RNA sequence: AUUAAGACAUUCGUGAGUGAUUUAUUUCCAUGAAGUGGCGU
């Protein structure tokens, strides 16, 4: 068809330099250029050069000379905001107890930078 | 003193009336705010 809609369940918290806005979420600026790389990489069977003469065929290109982007709209958007935020360093800290209802630590993680912040 | 004399091709008259430099045309396409710990063996 024209739009396909799908919901995503997430695993692992993200690290976001967006954090800020409520509805900050995960970026199609990121999602776009890899799934286009991925699909041409899996059109044409582990080769991106022979995905991309079969993606030219069927014109499925913006841009049939010069780039891997693919004739397609990725957005994506919070249905709702209660977010649970995170706060991830590569340091035993001790927990205090006094912090808002969505404040939770990771200590010990590979994530080592913003390590100042304790 | 002679088939002669006399007589403005002249008067009046607005190059004018109606008339959008307008119809149409995406300042777009591309791109991961991301890479990485180390000593305390």
Same mark, same amino acid.
């Given at each position: 068809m024209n739009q396909l809609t799908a919901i995503l369940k997430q695993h %692992? *918290?993200?690290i976001? #330099? @967006?954090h800020n806005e409520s509805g900050a979420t995960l970026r199609a600026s990121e999602?776009? *250029?890899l799934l286009d790389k #991925?699909?041409?990489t899996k059109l044409g069977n582990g080769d991106i050069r022979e995905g991309r003469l079969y993606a030219k065929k069927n014109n499925w290109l913006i841009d049939n000379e010069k780039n891997y982007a693919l004739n397609y709209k990725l957005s994506i958007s919070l249905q709702k905001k209660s977010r649970l935020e995170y706060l991830i360093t590569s340091? %035993? #800290? *001790?927990?205090p107890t006094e912090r808002p209802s969505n404040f939770f630590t990771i200590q010990n993680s590979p994530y080592f930078? @913003?390590?100042k912040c304790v």
């Open positions: %692992t *918290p993200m976001h #330099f @967006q999602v776009k *250029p #991925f699909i041409l340091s %035993t #800290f *001790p927990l930078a @913003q390590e």
